[PDB]
Amino acid sequence: TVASISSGPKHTQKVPILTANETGATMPVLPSDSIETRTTYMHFNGSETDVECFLGR
Amino acid sequence: TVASISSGPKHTQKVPILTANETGATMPVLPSDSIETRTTYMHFNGSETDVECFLGRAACVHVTEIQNKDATGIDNHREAKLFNDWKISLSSLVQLRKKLELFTYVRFDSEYTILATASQPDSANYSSNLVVQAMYVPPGAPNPKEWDDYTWQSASNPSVFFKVGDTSRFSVPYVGLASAYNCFYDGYSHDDAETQYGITVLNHMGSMAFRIVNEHDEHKTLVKIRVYHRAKHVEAWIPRAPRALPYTSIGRTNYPKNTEPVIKKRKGDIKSY
Amino acid sequence: PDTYTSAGFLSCWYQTSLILPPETTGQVYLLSFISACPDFKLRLMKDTQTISQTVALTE
Amino acid sequence: GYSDRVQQITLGNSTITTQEAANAVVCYAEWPEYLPDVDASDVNKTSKPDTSVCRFYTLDSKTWTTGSKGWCWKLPDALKDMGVFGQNMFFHSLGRSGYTVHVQCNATKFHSGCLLVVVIPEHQLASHEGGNVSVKYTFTHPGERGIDLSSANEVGGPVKDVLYNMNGTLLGNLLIFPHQFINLRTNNTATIVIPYINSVPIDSMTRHNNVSLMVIPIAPLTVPTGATPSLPITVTIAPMCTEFSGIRSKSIVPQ
Amino acid sequence: GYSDRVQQITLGNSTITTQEAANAVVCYAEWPEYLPDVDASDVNKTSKPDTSVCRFYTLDSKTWTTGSKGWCWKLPDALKDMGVFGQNMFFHSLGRSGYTVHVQCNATKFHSGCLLVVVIPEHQLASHEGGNVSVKYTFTHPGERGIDLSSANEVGGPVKDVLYNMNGTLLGNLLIFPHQFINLRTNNTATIVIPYINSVPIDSMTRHNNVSLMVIPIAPLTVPTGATPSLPITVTIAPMCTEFSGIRSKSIVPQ
Amino acid sequence: INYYKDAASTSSAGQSLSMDPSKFTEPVKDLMLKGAPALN
Amino acid sequence: INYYKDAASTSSAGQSLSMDPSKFTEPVKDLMLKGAPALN
Amino acid sequence: TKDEVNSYLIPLNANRQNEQVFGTNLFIGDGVFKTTLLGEIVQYYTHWSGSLRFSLMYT
Numbered sequence A: 001t002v003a004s005i006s007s008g009p010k011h012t013q014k015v016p017i018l019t020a021n022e023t024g025a026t027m028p029v030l031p032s033d034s035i036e037t038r039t040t041y042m043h044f045n046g047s048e049t050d051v052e053c054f055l056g057r
Numbered sequence B: 001t002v003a004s005i006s007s008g009p010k011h012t013q014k015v016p017i018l019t020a021n022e023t024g025a026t027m028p029v030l031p032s033d034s035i036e037t038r039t040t041y042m043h044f045n046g047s048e049t050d051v052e053c054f055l056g057r058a059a060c061v062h063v064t065e066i067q068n069k070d071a072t073g074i075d076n077h078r079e080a081k082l083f084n085d086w087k088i089s090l091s092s093l094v095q096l097r098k099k100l101e102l103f104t105y106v107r108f109d110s111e112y113t114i115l116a117t118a119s120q121p122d123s124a125n126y127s128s129n130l131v132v133q134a135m136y137v138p139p140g141a142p143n144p145k146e147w148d149d150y151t152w153q154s155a156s157n158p159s160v161f162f163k164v165g166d167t168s169r170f171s172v173p174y175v176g177l178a179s180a181y182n183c184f185y186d187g188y189s190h191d192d193a194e195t196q197y198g199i200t201v202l203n204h205m206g207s208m209a210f211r212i213v214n215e216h217d218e219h220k221t222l223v224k225i226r227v228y229h230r231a232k233h234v235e236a237w238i239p240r241a242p243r244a245l246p247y248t249s250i251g252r253t254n255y256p257k258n259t260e261p262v263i264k265k266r267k268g269d270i271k272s273y
Numbered sequence C: 001p002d003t004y005t006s007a008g009f010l011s012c013w014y015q016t017s018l019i020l021p022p023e024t025t026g027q028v029y030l031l032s033f034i035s036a037c038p039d040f041k042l043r044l045m046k047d048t049q050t051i052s053q054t055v056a057l058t059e
Numbered sequence D, E: 001g002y003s004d005r006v007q008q009i010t011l012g013n014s015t016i017t018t019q020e021a022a023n024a025v026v027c028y029a030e031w032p033e034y035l036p037d038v039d040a041s042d043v044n045k046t047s048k049p050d051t052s053v054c055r056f057y058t059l060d061s062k063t064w065t066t067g068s069k070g071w072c073w074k075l076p077d078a079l080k081d082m083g084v085f086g087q088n089m090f091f092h093s094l095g096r097s098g099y100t101v102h103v104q105c106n107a108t109k110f111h112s113g114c115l116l117v118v119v120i121p122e123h124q125l126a127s128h129e130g131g132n133v134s135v136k137y138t139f140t141h142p143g144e145r146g147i148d149l150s151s152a153n154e155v156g157g158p159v160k161d162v163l164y165n166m167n168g169t170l171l172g173n174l175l176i177f178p179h180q181f182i183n184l185r186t187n188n189t190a191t192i193v194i195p196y197i198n199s200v201p202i203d204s205m206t207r208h209n210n211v212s213l214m215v216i217p218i219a220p221l222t223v224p225t226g227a228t229p230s231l232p233i234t235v236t237i238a239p240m241c242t243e244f245s246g247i248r249s250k251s252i253v254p255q
Numbered sequence F, G: 001i002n003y004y005k006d007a008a009s010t011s012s013a014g015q016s017l018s019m020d021p022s023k024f025t026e027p028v029k030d031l032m033l034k035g036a037p038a039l040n
Numbered sequence H: 001t002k003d004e005v006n007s008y009l010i011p012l013n014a015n016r017q018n019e020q021v022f023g024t025n026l027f028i029g030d031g032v033f034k035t036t037l038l039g040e041i042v043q044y045y046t047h048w049s050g051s052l053r054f055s056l057m058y059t
């Protein structure tokens, strides 16, 4: 799984970082929408935040 | 496997025993390069020198003590050993320490065994079985203040309850923040002029806290806790020179002043046997 | 909060400046939100400093 | 006619020739390489100045005399002020690097003396005070000057006792670390290639030094009769495969 | 729903968003690119710091008032002190770069005013003295401050007369240079991409500026009634495709 | 048979049976052959 | 191996490995595409 | 000085130039962040890693 993909300079008409929060959504913006990133992998599953785990001790 | 091959007289232009140590290598010279040998087999694998084996037996890492007594009128439970804690660390007791510091970075799961024995110093009667509670308190968790705080509810924090005289055992995965634990760290936590130097800054693993669950009887009971640690699934990188001088502190390399010569002086000459 | 492990600072400044239309006055406000990216990992559960108690509650 | 003996290292815009080498050591048998994605964590693209940072900087020279105890430099500290390497260093949040270290000391066939040149990964120093006294920052960040093991104890500084490696271990066992000797009779330089060694993929270049280079006279310098009793030792070091990441405002560090 | 109007430029570790753009100009219809071998002369491998130099630096802000005559910045001068761009600049013998220039000025639908934003390749200034008086170095290297065309003549400085572009040509014809207007009623930013334009493949970054960026009020600022009579103008500029070559000691320049 | 779900809970690991001293005993850049001269 | 007959007596459940924040993060009636204007 | 709806509002002043609107460190488990849902959950765990999304809505 990639945690971040590689992304480079941008000069577009397509701006993912401008939104309208009045709508009630949290738009899924990522580091790679606003800086230049390199690939990295997650190495993690989110196992210990499962509700079974959270309420299970 | 052969430990030595058979080899006979030599009169060559090819001399394996002359080398240049300035290069930094240790050339793999064998008995058969300089005497006449006979075949012999190894009969041995080097099993018990594997690092998993070397670091894999339980070592005592900590001895603490708590007492069961009437807390009535005690203004500071922590101070009365009504419960006590331990700022987890593996460098406080120094037998296991020298073994680990043969390496720079080490990675392993831990298996803890906790033995708790009771002592009744002041002539006594009937001892009612005490149950110890060991609970792990990680960094940024409500540290406990009395021996019976809400903290001990430990609703999200792993805790084990066992009886004095018995042993508790459980195993914790490698909890390091990086890829390995640093046995050494030549750095600071930030570039301040007075911040501590060493690892102590690095191995912020929080502390472990013990208490007796029982209320008090008429006499007082001393319970002494011994924590044993066994590394399992060991991985070690970069060997270093063994520790020669005595240790003075958890987490610093410092040795004591006016220490004694560590190399044994000859009783005789260089020429002596 | 821990030093070695610290993450930085966040600041905000006028790039040019706020300009109100005529017939208008005073301060305007920004609302600010925080949420985690899908990137995020949390591990090693423990107890929160955010809640405590001194005697058991009853009905 | 290639000898182990003559060598040329060209790195960037700078070249070194030695006509009296004794092979070269590559720490742990690994050559410096950049940071692979599979090992990456920070999402930032890194900056690789290449030839402007990966060239040879020659630190100021030392003087070996019959009384010398040995000198110690820390990396990347020693280079904190060299050209653009240094700027990059203070300006990014994180950086990573390997190095080629070339230590030089020539004499004649009448001199004797032998230096140990060793690289120690994570050399945490000891306070000469004992107990749990710390070693202040400035003291472990001598810069190009390095630490002079025959200088006096100072307050907040490290211990400078050579038979103990500045940490409670014996000089004799430093040979377990990548090292090479300079024996006037054999050798005139020592070269060690250092791959990046850390428990994290990239780190801060200012709060943590990841190797100390140490040059220690072991067989005392002995000059021919009525020769001047000393020789200079020069250290030239080149960052290799350097990468910087997390650019910003420019660190301010003590002293 | 894409408009010519909203835009995002992400370059390095910095991003700009405009919700009121008027397209963008790319000088001479060419986009910045690195130096091809077929065009190369110096044999040195060049250094391409990439993301550490190719990000957006916002110069200090100006204040447009009813009396403003216009401001002038020179490149690469204006950036001579920005982060690692600047260091690289003083440390290599030669360097080359293109830029993205983003000029910002917002107001309200009651204001009026119109700025000309123009890039002039090789803008050789004139001495206000006439004859063959030269314009001293310092005067043509104002740094991030730029030149303020409504400041007074100084000695050894350039002339600051706007109807003459600081060189004997009329303001009206500046439109032959890549340019864009900021008309409060339309526009709130201007963006120009500048490819590297020179008669040599790479040059010195300190003895020669290769473009002047000029922002000139043309229709005077007119604020609504009882509004404060002024607006700030901000200039943010990002080097793009930068390459440095011939590294060494670090130039020392007048003043 | 593992009785437990997590990997940390398993017993000790089993012998590397890896063993390669050359990273420590011969980290030289140009290979040295035993028997050939050290310095040519 | 379950040693007991009733389901309540079995150990903890196993990770949902379900995970879909959109019911919480994007409950909008008309779909919003990142990059397209929020309000058209 | 007492919790109020007003500590959610970052004020902005018309006509200021060059100046600073707000500042904060990023200790997500403490300080401003601490009572937010993110802050509040982070506190059930010991370690965190990942990207954060900080947005500002203008009013």
Ligand SMILES: Cc1cc(CCCCCOc2ccc(C3=NCCO3)cc2)on1
Pocket (backbone or CB within 6 Å): B088, B089, B090, B091, B110, B112, B134, B135, B136, B158, B159, B160, B172, B175, B181, B182, B203, B205, B208
């Ligand atoms: C280096 C180095 C390595 C270590 C050991 C780290 C162990 C991780 C934390 O240790 C514990 C200890 C006890 C418990 C515990 N949970 C319930 C009872 O005890 C959990 C983790 O310490 N320094």
